[PDB]
């Protein structure tokens, strides 16, 4: 069975960015419902069960470009009372509506912390080694819920 719309697809993958392995695992996902980054989904379309391949996904088809508006300066007093506020530290946060807006610390100067609200992989090209392990039809329950089930 080939990867396509409304198939549940099981893949084994390794993610590398700029020569460094960032993640590895196995995933089952519902194909064609914006559940995967667009570029990888495009690369998987039409693949047969058992196929293995490499996929270089440009930032634009992955987590998008780095938005300069995402880099902001916030007061140090906004951070958890006894947290370590240093470059690379991550904190969850939300916007003025309530949508998830996690951040990464870029730099600290006195009581001012420069943070980045961009996705950590924004602007990065992603390299995947991928194996298609299984392809099956989605169940009605999966189609109604919009994602794969165990
Ligand atoms: C609770 C339910 C949520 C569910 C949560 C998890 C299973 C927990 C687990 C830690 C998530 C991922 O672990 C599998 C982990 O995988 C990465 O490490 C990774 O290697 C990656 O990039 N992958 C995974 C392998 C397929 C390609 C890509 C992906 O497409 O992943 C998909 C993805 C993020 C798609 C977004 C969806 C929103 C779109 O807007 C965006 O479009 C840009 C693309 C994953 C599979 C989602 O469908 C499933 C979820 O997120 C990300 C670097 C970080 C990501 O952690 C956050
Ligand atoms: Cl899914
Ligand atoms: Mg069909
Ligand atoms: Mg097989
Ligand atoms: Mg100032």
Residue numbers in the entry: 1 to 150
Task: Provide the publication's sentences verbatim.
In addition, we carried out co-crystallization with the FKBP inhibitor FK506. To the best of our knowledge, these represent the first structures of an FKBP domain in complex with long, unmodified peptides, and the first structures of a member of the SlyD family in complex with a macrolide inhibitor. Indeed, the only structure with a substrate-free IF domain is TtSlyDFL:FK506, which was crystallized in the absence of a peptide. FK506 binds in a similar way to all three copies of TtSlyD in the asymmetric unit of TtSlyDFL:FK506 and in both copies in TtSlyDΔIF:FK506, but exhibits some structural variation in parts of the molecule that are more distal to the binding pocket. The binding mode is similar to that observed in the FK506–FKBP12 complex. Specifically, the pipecolinyl ring, which mimics a proline side chain, is inserted into the center of the hydrophobic pocket, and four hydrogen bonds are formed: two to the backbone of N35 and I37 (V55 and I56 in FKBP12), and one each to the side chains of D23 and Y63 (D37 and Y82 in FKBP12). Apart from these conventional hydrogen bonds, a number of weaker CH–O hydrogen bonds are also present. Most noteworthy are three potential interactions between the C9 carbonyl oxygen of FK506 and CH groups of Y13, L15, and F128, which are reminiscent of three putative CH–O interactions observed between FK506 and FKBP12 residues Y26, F36, and F99. A comparison of the FK506 and peptide binding modes reveals that the interactions between FK506 and the backbone atoms of N35 and I37, which are mediated by the O2 carbonyl oxygen atom at C1 and the O10 hydroxyl group at C24, respectively, overlap with the two β-strand type interactions formed by K28S2 in the S2 and S2-W23A peptides. It furthermore shows that the pipecolinyl ring partially overlaps with the side chain of cis-P29S2 in both peptide binding modes, but is in a roughly orthogonal orientation relative to these, which enables it to reach considerably deeper into the pocket.
Peptidyl-prolyl isomerases (PPIases) catalyze cis/trans isomerization of peptidyl-prolyl bonds, which is often rate-limiting for protein folding. SlyD is a two-domain enzyme containing both a PPIase FK506-binding protein (FKBP) domain and an insert-in-flap (IF) chaperone domain. In order to improve our understanding of the mechanism of SlyD and of FKBPs in general, we set out to analyze the kinetics, energetics, and structural basis for substrate binding and inhibition of SlyD from Thermus thermophilus (TtSlyD) using 15-residue-long unmodified peptides, which we reasoned would be better mimics of natural unfolded protein substrates than the traditionally used 4-nitroanilide tetrapeptides. In total, we obtained five structures of TtSlyDFL and three of TtSlyDΔIF at a maximum resolution of up to 1.4 Å.
